[PDB]
Amino acid sequence: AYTNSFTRGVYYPDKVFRSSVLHSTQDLFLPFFSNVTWFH
Amino acid sequence: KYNENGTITDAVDCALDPLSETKCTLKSFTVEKGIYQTSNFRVQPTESI
Amino acid sequence: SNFGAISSVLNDILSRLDPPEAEVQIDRLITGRLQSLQTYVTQQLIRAA
Amino acid sequence: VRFPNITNLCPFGEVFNATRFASVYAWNRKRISNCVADYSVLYNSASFSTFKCYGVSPTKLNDLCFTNVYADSFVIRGDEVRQIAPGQTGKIADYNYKLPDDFTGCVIAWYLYRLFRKSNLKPFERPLQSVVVLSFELPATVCGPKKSTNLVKNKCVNFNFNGLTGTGVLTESNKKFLPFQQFGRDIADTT
Numbered sequence A: 001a002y003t004n005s006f007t008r009g010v011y012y013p014d015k016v017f018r019s020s021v022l023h024s025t026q027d028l029f030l031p032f033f034s035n036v037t038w039f040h
Numbered sequence B: 001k002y003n004e005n006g007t008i009t010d011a012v013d014c015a016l017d018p019l020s021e022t023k024c025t026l027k028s029f030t031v032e033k034g035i036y037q038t039s040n041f042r043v044q045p046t047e048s049i
Numbered sequence C: 001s002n003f004g005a006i007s008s009v010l011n012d013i014l015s016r017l018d019p020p021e022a023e024v025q026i027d028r029l030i031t032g033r034l035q036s037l038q039t040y041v042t043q044q045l046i047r048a049a
Numbered sequence D: 001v002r003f004p005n006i007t008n009l010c011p012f013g014e015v016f017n018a019t020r021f022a023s024v025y026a027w028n029r030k031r032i033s034n035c036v037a038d039y040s041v042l043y044n045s046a047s048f049s050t051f052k053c054y055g056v057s058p059t060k061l062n063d064l065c066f067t068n069v070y071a072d073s074f075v076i077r078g079d080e081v082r083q084i085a086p087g088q089t090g091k092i093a094d095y096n097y098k099l100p101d102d103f104t105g106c107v108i109a110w111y112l113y114r115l116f117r118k119s120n121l122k123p124f125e126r127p128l129q130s131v132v133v134l135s136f137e138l139p140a141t142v143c144g145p146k147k148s149t150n151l152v153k154n155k156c157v158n159f160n161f162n163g164l165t166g167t168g169v170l171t172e173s174n175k176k177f178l179p180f181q182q183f184g185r186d187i188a189d190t191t
């Protein structure tokens, strides 16, 4: 019925090319290790 | 964490646990041995009067 | 950093505004950038000693 | 100068000559996209009693790229035309139609309206007892009318790529973009 959401649901915040950097993003994300409902 | 090809290969959630907030303050994924100031805390007011 | 101005890039203040109210936005960036050069130079003089 | 291959005009005569206007409690909204029209046609000193711009200057509207234009349509009484500025308080600016505190666009001016309202509206939010606002946000996609030129590499030039100005040397790149990415930046956040 419920399950775990390890490290999933990360997207690209914008359309600016970046390479070999460590950018900090503030946006709406799916938090790690949250509980997701299972439907069937 | 981007790479040579400009693709995201890793991330860190900066409010999961204390080690993640340490990693976000130092802006790295490996942390050397030490003690690090990361945040503050403060109790919020319960109601108005 | 934009230091209170509409943009931190100077070319697109100069391409968007007219010389009366472009100087109002350029003075904010000038004071913000002088203060940071001044802070850099002072701590370099303290480390050199 | 590099502006994209695009030819058609924007329907500015549509919103300025349709004799059916709208009201202030329920105002008329239109998106403008993918068209190369002039703004100096409005600089022609027509029947414009108010012509007032906020984030830009009207002389420089010809050579920018805006990504969108929203057009608004309502009718005011006439004496309250100072309530369609940012940071104003009144029966329109609090109960019928409110601009944000950070507005970028032009205001042009030349019949039920709401009287009672339980809370002041949010910016751009939609008992009743009985003007065009252009807004935009700084992909080019609107791109005012300016003739493009040819591309020159390997030497110090000025450039203008959809309103992004600068000066530098242009060479060919080996950084493989992904087919949604347009700009490119570095550690210090520069193009």
Ligand SMILES: *[C@@H]1O[C@H](CO)[C@@H](O)[C@H](O)[C@H]1NC(C)=O
Residues within 6 Å of the ligand: B003, B004, B005
């Ligand atoms: C980047 O992509 C290319 C494919 O064109 C591949 O050959 C290369 O190994 C990739 N780089 C890394 C670090 O995986």
